[PDB]
Coordinates of C-alpha atoms and ligand atoms in Angstrom, one line a residue:
X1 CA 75.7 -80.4 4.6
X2 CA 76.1 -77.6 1.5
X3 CA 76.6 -79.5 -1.7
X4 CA 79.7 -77.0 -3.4
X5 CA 79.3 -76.0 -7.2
X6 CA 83.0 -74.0 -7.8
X7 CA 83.8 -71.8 -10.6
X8 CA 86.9 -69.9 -11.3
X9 CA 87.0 -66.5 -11.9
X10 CA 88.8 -63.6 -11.1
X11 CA 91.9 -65.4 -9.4
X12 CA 90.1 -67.4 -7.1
X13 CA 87.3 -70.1 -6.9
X14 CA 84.0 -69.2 -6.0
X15 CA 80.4 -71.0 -5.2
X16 CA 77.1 -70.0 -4.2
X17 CA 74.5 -72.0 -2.2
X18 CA 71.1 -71.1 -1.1
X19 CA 70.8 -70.7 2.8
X20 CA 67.3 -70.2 4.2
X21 CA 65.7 -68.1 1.0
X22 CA 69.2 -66.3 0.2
X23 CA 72.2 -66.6 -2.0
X24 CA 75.2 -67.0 0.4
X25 CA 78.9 -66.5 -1.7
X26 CA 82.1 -68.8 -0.5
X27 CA 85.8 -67.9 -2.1
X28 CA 88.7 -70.3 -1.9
X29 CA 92.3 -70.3 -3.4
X30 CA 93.1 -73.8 -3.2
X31 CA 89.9 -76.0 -3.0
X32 CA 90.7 -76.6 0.4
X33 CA 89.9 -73.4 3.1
X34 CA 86.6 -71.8 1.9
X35 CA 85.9 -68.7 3.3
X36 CA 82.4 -67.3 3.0
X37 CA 82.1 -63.9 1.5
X38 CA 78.4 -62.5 2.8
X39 CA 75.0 -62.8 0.8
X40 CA 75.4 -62.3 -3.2
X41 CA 71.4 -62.2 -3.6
X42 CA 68.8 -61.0 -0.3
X43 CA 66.3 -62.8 -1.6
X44 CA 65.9 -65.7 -3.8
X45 CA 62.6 -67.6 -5.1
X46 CA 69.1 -77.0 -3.8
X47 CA 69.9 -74.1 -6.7
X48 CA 70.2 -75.2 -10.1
X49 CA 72.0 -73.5 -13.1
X50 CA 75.6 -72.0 -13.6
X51 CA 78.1 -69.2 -13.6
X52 CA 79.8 -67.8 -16.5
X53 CA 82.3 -64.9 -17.4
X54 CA 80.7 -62.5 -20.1
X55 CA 84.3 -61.5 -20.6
X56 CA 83.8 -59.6 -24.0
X57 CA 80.5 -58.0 -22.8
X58 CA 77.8 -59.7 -25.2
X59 CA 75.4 -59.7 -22.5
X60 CA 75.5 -55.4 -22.6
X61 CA 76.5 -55.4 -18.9
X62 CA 80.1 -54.5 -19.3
X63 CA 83.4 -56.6 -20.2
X64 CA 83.9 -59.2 -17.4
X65 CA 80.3 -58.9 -15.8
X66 CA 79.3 -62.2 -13.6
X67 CA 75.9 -63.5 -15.3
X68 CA 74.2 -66.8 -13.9
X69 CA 71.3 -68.5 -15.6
X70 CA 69.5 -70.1 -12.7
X71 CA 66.3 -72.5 -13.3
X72 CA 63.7 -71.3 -10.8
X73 CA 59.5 -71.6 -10.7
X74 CA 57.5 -69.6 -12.9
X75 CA 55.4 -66.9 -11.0
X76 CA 52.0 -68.4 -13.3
X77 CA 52.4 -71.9 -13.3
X78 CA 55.7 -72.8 -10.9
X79 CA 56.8 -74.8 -13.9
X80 CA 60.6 -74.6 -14.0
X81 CA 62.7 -72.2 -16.6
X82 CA 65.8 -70.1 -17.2
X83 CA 66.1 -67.0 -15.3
X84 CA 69.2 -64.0 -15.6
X85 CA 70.6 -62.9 -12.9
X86 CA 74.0 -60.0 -13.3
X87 CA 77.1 -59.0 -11.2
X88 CA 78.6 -55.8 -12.4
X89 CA 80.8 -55.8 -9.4
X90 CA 83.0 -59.3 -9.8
X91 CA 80.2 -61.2 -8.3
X92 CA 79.7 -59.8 -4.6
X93 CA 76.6 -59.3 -5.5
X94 CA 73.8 -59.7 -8.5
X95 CA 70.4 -58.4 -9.7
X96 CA 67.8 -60.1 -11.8
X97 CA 67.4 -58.8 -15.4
X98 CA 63.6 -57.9 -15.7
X99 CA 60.7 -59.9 -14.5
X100 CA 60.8 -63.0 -17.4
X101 CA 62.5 -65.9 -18.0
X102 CA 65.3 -66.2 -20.4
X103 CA 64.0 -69.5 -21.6
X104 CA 60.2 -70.4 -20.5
X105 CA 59.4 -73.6 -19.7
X106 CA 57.8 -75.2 -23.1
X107 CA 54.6 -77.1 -21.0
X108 CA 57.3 -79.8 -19.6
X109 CA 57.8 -81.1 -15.9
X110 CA 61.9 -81.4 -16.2
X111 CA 63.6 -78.1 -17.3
X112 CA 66.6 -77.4 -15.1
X113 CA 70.1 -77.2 -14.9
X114 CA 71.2 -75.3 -17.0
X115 CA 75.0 -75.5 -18.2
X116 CA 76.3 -72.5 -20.6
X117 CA 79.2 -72.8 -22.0
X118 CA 81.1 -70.0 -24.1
X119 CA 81.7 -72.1 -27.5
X120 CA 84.9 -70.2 -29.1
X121 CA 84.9 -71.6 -32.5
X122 CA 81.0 -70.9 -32.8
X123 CA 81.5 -67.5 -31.3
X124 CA 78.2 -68.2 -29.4
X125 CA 77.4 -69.5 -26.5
X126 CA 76.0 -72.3 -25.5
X127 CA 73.1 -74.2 -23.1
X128 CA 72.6 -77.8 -22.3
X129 CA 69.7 -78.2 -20.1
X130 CA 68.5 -81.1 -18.3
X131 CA 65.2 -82.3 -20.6
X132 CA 63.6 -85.8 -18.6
X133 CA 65.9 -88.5 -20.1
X134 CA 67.1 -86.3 -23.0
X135 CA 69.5 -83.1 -22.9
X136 CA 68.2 -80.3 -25.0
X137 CA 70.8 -77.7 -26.4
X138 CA 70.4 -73.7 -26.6
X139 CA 72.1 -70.9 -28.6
X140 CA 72.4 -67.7 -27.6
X141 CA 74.2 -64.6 -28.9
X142 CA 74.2 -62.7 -25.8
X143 CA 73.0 -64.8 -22.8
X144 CA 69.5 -63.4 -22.5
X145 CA 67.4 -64.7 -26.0
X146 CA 68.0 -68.4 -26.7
X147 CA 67.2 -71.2 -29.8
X148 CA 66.7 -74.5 -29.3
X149 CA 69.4 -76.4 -31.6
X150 CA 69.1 -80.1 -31.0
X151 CA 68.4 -82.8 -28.1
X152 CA 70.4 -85.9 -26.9
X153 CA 68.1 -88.6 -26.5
X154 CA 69.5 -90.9 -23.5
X155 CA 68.3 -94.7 -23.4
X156 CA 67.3 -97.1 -20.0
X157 CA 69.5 -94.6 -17.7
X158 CA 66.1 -93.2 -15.9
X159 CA 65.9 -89.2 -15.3
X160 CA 69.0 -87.0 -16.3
X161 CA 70.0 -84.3 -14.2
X162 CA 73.0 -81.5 -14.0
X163 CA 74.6 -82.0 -17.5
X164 CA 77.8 -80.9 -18.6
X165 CA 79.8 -80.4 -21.6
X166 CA 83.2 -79.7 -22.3
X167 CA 86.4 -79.8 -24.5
X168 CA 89.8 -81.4 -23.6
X169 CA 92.6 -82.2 -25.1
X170 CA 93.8 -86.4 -24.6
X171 CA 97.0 -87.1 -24.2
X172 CA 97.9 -88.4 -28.1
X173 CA 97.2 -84.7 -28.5
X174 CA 93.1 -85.2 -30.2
X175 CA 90.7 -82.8 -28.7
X176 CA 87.3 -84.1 -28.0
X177 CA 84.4 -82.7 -26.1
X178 CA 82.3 -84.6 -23.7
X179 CA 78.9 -84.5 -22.8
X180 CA 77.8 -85.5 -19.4
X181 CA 75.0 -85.7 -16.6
X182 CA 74.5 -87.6 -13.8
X183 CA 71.5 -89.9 -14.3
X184 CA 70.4 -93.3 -12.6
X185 CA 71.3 -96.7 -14.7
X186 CA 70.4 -99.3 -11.4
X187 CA 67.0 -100.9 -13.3
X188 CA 70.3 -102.0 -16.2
X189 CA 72.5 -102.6 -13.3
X190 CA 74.4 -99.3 -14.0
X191 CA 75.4 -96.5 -11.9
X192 CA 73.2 -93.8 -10.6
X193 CA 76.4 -91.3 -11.0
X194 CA 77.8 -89.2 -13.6
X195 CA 77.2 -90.8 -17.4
X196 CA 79.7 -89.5 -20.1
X197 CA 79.7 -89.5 -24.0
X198 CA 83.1 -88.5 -25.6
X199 CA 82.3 -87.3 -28.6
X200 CA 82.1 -84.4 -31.2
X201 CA 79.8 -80.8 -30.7
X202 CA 79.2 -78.9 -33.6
X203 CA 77.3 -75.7 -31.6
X204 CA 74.4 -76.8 -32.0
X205 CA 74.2 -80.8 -32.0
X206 CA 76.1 -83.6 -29.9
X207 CA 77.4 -86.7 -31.9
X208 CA 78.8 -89.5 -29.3
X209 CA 81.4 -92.1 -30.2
X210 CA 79.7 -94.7 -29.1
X211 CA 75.7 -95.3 -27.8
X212 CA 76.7 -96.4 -24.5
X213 CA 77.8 -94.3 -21.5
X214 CA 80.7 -94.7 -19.7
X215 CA 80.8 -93.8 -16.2
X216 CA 82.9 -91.9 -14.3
X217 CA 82.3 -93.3 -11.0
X218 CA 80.9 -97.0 -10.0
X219 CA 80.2 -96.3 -6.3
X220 CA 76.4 -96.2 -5.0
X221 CA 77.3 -92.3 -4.0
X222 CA 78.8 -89.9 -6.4
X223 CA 75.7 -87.5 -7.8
X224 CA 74.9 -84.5 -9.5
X225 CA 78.8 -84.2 -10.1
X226 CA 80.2 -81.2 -11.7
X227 CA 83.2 -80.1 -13.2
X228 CA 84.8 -77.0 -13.7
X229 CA 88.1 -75.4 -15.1
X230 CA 91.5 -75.5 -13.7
X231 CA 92.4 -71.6 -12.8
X232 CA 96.4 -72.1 -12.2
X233 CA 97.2 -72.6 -15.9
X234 CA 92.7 -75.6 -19.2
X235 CA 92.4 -78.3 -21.7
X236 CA 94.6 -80.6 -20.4
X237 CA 92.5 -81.3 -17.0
X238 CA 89.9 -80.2 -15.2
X239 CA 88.6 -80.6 -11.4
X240 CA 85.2 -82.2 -10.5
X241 CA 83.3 -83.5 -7.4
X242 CA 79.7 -84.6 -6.3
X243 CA 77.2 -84.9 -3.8
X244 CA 76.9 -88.3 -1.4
X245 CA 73.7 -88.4 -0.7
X246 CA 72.7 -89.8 3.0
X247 CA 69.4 -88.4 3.4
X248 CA 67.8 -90.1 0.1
X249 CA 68.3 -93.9 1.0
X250 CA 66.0 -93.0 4.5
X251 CA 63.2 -96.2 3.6
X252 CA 60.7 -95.6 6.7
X253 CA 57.3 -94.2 6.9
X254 CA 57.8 -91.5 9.1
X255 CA 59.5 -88.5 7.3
X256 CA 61.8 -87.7 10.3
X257 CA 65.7 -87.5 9.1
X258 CA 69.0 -87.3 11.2
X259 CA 71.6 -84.4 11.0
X260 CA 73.9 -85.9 8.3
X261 CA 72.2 -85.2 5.1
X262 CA 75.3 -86.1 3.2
X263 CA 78.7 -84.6 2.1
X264 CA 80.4 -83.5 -0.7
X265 CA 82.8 -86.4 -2.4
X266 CA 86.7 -85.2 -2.5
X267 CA 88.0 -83.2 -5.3
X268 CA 89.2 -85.0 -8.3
X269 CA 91.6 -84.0 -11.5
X270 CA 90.1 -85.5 -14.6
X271 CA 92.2 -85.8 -17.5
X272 CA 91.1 -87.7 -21.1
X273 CA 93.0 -90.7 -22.1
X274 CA 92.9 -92.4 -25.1
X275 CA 92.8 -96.0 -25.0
X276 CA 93.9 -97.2 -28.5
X277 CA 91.8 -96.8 -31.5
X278 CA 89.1 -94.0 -31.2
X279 CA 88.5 -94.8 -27.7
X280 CA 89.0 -92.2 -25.0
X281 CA 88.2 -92.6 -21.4
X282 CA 88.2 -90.0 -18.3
X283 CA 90.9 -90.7 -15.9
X284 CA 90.4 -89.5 -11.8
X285 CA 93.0 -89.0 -9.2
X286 CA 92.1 -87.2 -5.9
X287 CA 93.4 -83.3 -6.5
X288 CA 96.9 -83.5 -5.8
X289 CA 96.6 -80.4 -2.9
X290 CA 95.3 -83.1 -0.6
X291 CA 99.0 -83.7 0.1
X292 CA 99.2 -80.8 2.2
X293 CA 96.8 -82.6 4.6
X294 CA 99.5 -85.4 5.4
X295 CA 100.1 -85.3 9.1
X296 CA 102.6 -88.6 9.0
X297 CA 103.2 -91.4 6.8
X298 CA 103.9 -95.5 7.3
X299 CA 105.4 -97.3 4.3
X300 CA 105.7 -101.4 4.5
X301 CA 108.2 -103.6 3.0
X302 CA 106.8 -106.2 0.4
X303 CA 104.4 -108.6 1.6
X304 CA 103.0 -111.8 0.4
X305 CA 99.4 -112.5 1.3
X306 CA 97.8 -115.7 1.2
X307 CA 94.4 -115.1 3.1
X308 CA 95.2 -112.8 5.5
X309 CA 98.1 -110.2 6.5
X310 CA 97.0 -108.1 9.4
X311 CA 98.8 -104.6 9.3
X312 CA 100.3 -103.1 12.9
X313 CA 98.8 -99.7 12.0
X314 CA 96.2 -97.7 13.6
X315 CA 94.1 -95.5 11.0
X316 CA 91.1 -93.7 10.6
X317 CA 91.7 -90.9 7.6
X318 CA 94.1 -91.6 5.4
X319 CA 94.8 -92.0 1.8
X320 CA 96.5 -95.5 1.1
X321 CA 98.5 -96.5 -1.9
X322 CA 99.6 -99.8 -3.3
X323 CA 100.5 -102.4 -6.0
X324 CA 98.9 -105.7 -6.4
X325 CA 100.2 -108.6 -8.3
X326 CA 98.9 -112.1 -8.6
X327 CA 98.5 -115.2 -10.4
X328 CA 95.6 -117.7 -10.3
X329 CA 93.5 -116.2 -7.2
X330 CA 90.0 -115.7 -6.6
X331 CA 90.0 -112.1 -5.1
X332 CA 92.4 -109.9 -3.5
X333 CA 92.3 -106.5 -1.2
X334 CA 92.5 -105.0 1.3
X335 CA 89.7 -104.6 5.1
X336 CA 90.1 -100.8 5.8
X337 CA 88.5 -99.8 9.3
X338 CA 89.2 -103.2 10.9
X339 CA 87.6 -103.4 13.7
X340 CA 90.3 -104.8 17.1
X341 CA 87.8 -108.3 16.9
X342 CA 87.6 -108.7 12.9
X343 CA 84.3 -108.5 12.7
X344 CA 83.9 -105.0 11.1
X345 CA 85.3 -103.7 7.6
X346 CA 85.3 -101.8 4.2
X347 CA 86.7 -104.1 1.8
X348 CA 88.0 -102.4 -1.4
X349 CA 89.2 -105.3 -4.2
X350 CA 89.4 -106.7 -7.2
X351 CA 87.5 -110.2 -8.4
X352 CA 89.4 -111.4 -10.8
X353 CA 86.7 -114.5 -11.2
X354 CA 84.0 -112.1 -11.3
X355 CA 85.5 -109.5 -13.6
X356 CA 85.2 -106.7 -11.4
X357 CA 86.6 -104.2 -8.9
X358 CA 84.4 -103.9 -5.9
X359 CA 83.9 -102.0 -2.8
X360 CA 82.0 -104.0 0.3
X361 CA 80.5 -101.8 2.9
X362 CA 78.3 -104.7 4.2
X363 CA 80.0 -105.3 7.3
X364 CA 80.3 -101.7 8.6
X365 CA 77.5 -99.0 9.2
X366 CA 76.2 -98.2 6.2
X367 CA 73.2 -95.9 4.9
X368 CA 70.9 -99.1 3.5
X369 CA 68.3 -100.6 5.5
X370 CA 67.4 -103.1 3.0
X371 CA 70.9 -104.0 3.0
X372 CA 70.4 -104.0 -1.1
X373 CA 73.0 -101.1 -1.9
X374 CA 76.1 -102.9 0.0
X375 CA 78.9 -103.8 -3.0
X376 CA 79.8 -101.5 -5.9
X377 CA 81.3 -102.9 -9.1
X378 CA 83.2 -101.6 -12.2
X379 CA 84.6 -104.5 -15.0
X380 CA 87.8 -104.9 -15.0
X381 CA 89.7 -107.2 -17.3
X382 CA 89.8 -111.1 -15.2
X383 CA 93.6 -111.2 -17.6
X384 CA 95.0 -108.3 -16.0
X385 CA 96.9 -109.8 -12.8
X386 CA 98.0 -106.3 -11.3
X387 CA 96.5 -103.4 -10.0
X388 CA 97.3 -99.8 -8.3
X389 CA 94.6 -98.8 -5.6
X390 CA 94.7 -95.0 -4.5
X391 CA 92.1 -95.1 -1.3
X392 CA 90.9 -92.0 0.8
X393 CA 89.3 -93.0 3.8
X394 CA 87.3 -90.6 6.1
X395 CA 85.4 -91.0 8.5
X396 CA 82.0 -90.8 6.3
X397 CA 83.4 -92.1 2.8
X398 CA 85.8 -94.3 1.2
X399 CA 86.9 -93.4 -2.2
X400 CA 88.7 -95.6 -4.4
X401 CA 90.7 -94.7 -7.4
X402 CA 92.0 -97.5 -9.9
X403 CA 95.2 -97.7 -11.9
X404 CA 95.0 -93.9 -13.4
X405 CA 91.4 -93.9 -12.4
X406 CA 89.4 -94.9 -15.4
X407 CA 87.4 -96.4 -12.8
X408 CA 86.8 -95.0 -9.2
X409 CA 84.3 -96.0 -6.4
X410 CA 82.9 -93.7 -4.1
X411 CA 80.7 -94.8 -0.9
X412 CA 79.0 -93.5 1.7
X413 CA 80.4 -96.0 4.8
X414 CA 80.1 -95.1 8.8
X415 CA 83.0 -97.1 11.0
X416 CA 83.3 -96.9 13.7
X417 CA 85.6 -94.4 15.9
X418 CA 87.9 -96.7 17.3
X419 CA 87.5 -99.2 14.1
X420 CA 91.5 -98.4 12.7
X421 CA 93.0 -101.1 11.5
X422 CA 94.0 -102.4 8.1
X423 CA 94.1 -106.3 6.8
X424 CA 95.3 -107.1 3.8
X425 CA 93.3 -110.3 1.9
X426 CA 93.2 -112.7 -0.3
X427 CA 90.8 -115.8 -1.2
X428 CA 92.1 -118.9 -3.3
X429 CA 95.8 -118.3 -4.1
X430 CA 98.7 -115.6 -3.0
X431 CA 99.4 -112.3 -4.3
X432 CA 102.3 -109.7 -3.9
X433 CA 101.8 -106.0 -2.3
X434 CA 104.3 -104.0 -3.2
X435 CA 104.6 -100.3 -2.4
X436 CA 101.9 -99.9 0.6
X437 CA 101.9 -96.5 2.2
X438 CA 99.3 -95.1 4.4
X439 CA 99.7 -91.3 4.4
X440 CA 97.4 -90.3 7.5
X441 CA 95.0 -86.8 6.8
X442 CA 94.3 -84.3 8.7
X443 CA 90.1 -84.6 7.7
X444 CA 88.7 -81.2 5.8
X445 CA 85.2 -82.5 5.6
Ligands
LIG501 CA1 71.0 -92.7 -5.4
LIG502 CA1 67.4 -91.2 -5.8

């Protein structure tokens, strides 16, 4: 119902969200119980921009203040553009600075979302803003006068929105920053998630390995994702998470819209991995505090599948693990949320004709009326004959990490209550599960 954008400061983890009108203020010490803290702002003109620690007071309201830059309508025109805002008081509560814009809209429809980063080695900070298809970048010596530096021109991946940029160090021990937004690739048969450059940032100017995005999610529903820093340790992972949008795939005339407008996607770790070369790829596990959730756990012998292996398990949230191997087969997974007659299912597999990890939600409720947003798909190599699946199920979502989660899939998909059981497939040839565990979840959501 409240998309969450966390930032750490100050011990704990903190978001804001508009609430109609005001600027409500939510705490939390370990992503899990959040606890809302009263209203930050009385009155406010979903919210777009971000949160940053002036710890060495270049702003001039004190080390440590709490300054966001928020894109709201101009009072002339209602074009959008940068607005200050200040919290002298470890962000309980903030006050605009003056009457003006930071950084006035230019004469342009899309100029929002602001993302400032403090950019050490530059001793400056820095904005990337959200631009139409490009992202424009900002310098700024003290948060409240800006120059524009550069812009990243996207290509064929429609309207960018929220971008992000940060450093992290892969694990060969390279440091490389990433540029990010989400953005919507489905006229190239791309996601409409979160598109990522690993490259190189000079302050003022983004220089991407390669033209092409990668994605770091190839579900139907993972949008305007964010990430943010890790507060118990920062370069060597970070957390993110996104909205899954319900309300947008409504396809009727009439403007009327049930309760469930969407929900916010599980917390992941992100961590950078280099592939070999000067390739590097973001890797996604679900945040390993979800453990704490576990009410029991069922853990199953080796099994050989050739078709079908019906589980004698009853579950509805749950995160379920496993190996796959195989030799010559078509496709292999599993049918999560079985219904008792068969009938209804969420089948999360790989094709290894096709090339491609999928996620069905075609035979279960599902958000599409037009029944054209059913099965999402990520490559994955046709060679490669064995697979690790990491799968939270809920009773809104499936989200499915694979191997160390270079690719993931996250989906809207509605089962039924009393649709619990778990059948294991395969089409044209046998394959070997190995390690299956279903650890059942108390749900947070
Ligand atoms: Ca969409
Ligand atoms: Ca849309």
């Amino acid at each position: 119902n409240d998309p969450q954008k966390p930032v750490y400061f100050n011990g704990k983890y903190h978001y804001y969200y508009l609430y109609n009108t005001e600027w409500r203020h939510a705490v939390s010490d370990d992503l899990v119980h959040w606890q809302d803290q009263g209203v930050a702002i009385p009155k406010y003109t979903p919210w777009s921009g971000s949160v940053v620690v002036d710890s060495q007071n270049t702003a001039g309201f004190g080390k440590g203040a709490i300054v966001a830059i928020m894109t709201q309508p101009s009072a002339n025109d209602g074009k959008e553009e940068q607005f200050l805002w200040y919290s002298q008081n470890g962000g309980k509560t903030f006050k605009p600075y003056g009457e003006e814009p930071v950084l006035p809209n230019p004469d342009t429809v899309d100029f929002r979302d602001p993302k400032v980063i403090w950019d050490e080695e530059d001793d400056k900070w820095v904005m990337a803003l959200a631009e139409g298809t490009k992202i424009g970048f900002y310098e700024s010596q003290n948060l409240k006068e800006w120059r524009y530096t550069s812009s990243f021109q996207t290509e064929n991946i429609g309207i960018i929105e929220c971008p992000d940029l940060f450093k992290m160090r892969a694990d060969d021990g390279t440091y490389k920053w990433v540029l990010g937004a989400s953005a919507n690739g489905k006229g190239a048969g791309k996601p409409n998630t979160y598109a990522y450059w690993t490259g190189s940032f000079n302050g003022n100017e983004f220089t991407a390995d390669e033209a092409e995005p990668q994605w770091l999610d190839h579900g139907f529903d993972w949008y305007a994702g964010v990430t943010f820093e890790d507060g118990e340790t920062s370069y060597e992972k970070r957390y993110a998470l996104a909205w899954m949008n319900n309300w947008d795939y409504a396809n009727r005339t009439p403007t009327w819209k049930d309760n469930f407008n969407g929900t916010d996607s599980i917390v992941r770790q992100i961590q950078l991995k280099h592939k070999g070369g000067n390739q590097y790829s973001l890797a996604s596990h679900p945040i390993d505090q979800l453990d704490e959730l576990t009410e029991s756990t069922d853990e199953f012998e080796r099994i050989e599948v050739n078709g079908s292996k019906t589980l004698q398990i009853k579950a509805n949230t749950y995160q379920l693990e496993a190996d796959i191997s195989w030799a010559d087969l078509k496709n292999v997974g599993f049918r999560l949320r079985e219904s008792a007659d068969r009938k209804r299912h969420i089948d999360v597999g790989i094709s290894a004709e096709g090339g491609y990890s999928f996620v069905n939600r075609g035979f279960t409720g599902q958000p599409d009326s037009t029944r054209t947003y059913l099965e999402s798909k990520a490559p994955f190599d046709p060679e490669k004959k064995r697979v690790h699946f990491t799968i939270i199920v809920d009773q809104n979502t499936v989200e499915a990490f694979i191997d160390d989660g270079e690719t993931t899939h996250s989906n809207l998909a509605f089962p039924d209550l009393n649709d619990t059981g778990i059948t294991l497939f395969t089409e044209n040839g046998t394959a070997v599960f190995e390690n299956l565990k279903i650890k059942h979840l108390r749900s947070i959501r």
